[PDB]
Design an enzyme around this catalytic site. Structure first.
Site, PDB file in Angstrom:
ATOM      1  CG  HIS A  40       4.880  17.832 -41.534  1.00  0.00           C
ATOM      2  ND1 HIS A  40       5.718  17.887 -42.633  1.00  0.00           N
ATOM      3  CD2 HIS A  40       5.473  16.951 -40.681  1.00  0.00           C
ATOM      4  CE1 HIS A  40       6.755  17.110 -42.401  1.00  0.00           C
ATOM      5  NE2 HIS A  40       6.659  16.545 -41.225  1.00  0.00           N
ATOM      6  CB  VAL A  57      24.484  15.727 -22.830  1.00  0.00           C
ATOM      7  CG1 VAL A  57      25.612  16.231 -21.926  1.00  0.00           C
ATOM      8  CG2 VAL A  57      24.154  14.253 -22.521  1.00  0.00           C
ATOM      9  CD  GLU A  62      24.192  22.653 -25.545  1.00  0.00           C
ATOM     10  OE1 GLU A  62      24.886  23.508 -24.882  1.00  0.00           O
ATOM     11  OE2 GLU A  62      24.295  21.396 -25.417  1.00  0.00           O
ATOM     12  CG  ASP A  84       5.607  19.942 -45.391  1.00  0.00           C
ATOM     13  OD1 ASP A  84       5.216  20.689 -44.458  1.00  0.00           O
ATOM     14  OD2 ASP A  84       6.139  18.801 -45.152  1.00  0.00           O
ATOM     15  N   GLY A 175      11.448  12.159 -37.086  1.00  0.00           N
ATOM     16  CA  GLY A 175      12.323  13.022 -36.350  1.00  0.00           C
ATOM     17  C   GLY A 175      13.266  13.880 -37.164  1.00  0.00           C
ATOM     18  CB  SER A 177       9.756  16.325 -40.283  1.00  0.00           C
ATOM     19  OG  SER A 177       9.046  15.360 -41.086  1.00  0.00           O
ATOM     20  N   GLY A 178      11.545  18.686 -41.450  1.00  0.00           N
ATOM     21  CA  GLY A 178      11.879  20.056 -41.293  1.00  0.00           C
ATOM     22  C   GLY A 178      13.351  20.363 -41.464  1.00  0.00           C
TER      23      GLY A 178
HETATM   24 CA   LIG Z   1      23.246  19.506 -26.204  1.00  0.00          CA
END
Ligand SMILES: [Ca+2]
Lengths: 223, 12
Positions: A40, A57, A62, A84, A175, A177-178
């Protein structure tokens, strides 16, 4: 995550954020090129954000990589939420390191009463809304099949399990989910659904990853 | 059944 705690930066290195100009779902890195999330959560144009702690931020660890392929389970049903699960392929392989790491798939299904680690950037309130900047964590037990079915009569399929606290106060939420449910160092669940968040007698409901391991490996091999 | 996408399943 309601009733959880601040994980600590990059302590859950398999946790990813799925981003469409904003965080909308979590996911779990299972190898350098593939992420498991919820069906979903499907959308075109997803950017996968790995190595995150504060999602608002730039902190320096990352990797942002576009999704090249999204593969929803063939038998996903958006009404019942059965099956799902989705696999996302990254356009390029992630650079694996101490902050960006894979989670192993299960070799067997987990048992009721096993404490698992659930994580995400979802709502931290059971009433109203408060969205965190940093990743949150929750330890919660797998519930019995009979307690899960009692909580959600007619709605729990063989591809779901419940985890959490029947008194309320501790759960995943919008938020999350998954994102992952990790037990004994394996990915056993995917955050899927519930009635409200952290409500009495309404535990979280999670996709049962152990039912899909052959499908996952076969899908990865052929895509 | 309420899915756990942000901000909600219906809101998208
Ligand atoms: Ca960050």
């Amino acid at each position: 995550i309601v009733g959880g705690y601040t994980c600590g930066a990059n302590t859950v290195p398999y946790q990813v954020s799925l981003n469409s100009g904003y965080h909308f779902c979590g996911g779990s890195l299972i190898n350098s090129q593939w992420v498991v999330s919820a069906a979903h959560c499907y959308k075109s144009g997803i950017q996968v954000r790995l190595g995150e702690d504060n999602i608002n931020v730039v902190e320096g660890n990352e990797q942002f990589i576009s999704a090249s392929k999204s593969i929803v389970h063939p038998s996903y049903n958006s009404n019942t939420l059965n099956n799902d699960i989705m696999l996302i392929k990254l356009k390029s392989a992630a650079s694996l390191n101490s902050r960006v790491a894979s989670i192993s798939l299960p070799t067997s299904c987990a048992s009721a009463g096993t404490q698992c680690l659930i994580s995400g950037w979802g709502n931290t309130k059971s009433s109203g809304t408060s969205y965190p900047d940093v990743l949150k964590c929750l330890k919660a037990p797998i519930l019995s099949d009979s307690s899960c079915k009692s909580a959600y009569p007619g709605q729990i399929t063989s591809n779901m399990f419940c985890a959490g606290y029947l008194e309320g106060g501790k759960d995943s939420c919008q938020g999350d989910s998954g994102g992952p449910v990790v037990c004994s160092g394996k990915l056993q669940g995917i955050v899927s659904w519930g009635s409200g968040c952290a409500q009495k007698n309404k535990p979280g409901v999670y996709t049962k990853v152990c039912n899909y391991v052959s499908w996952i490996k076969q899908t990865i091999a052929s895509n | 059944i309420s899915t756990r996408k942000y901000p909600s399943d219906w809101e998208e």
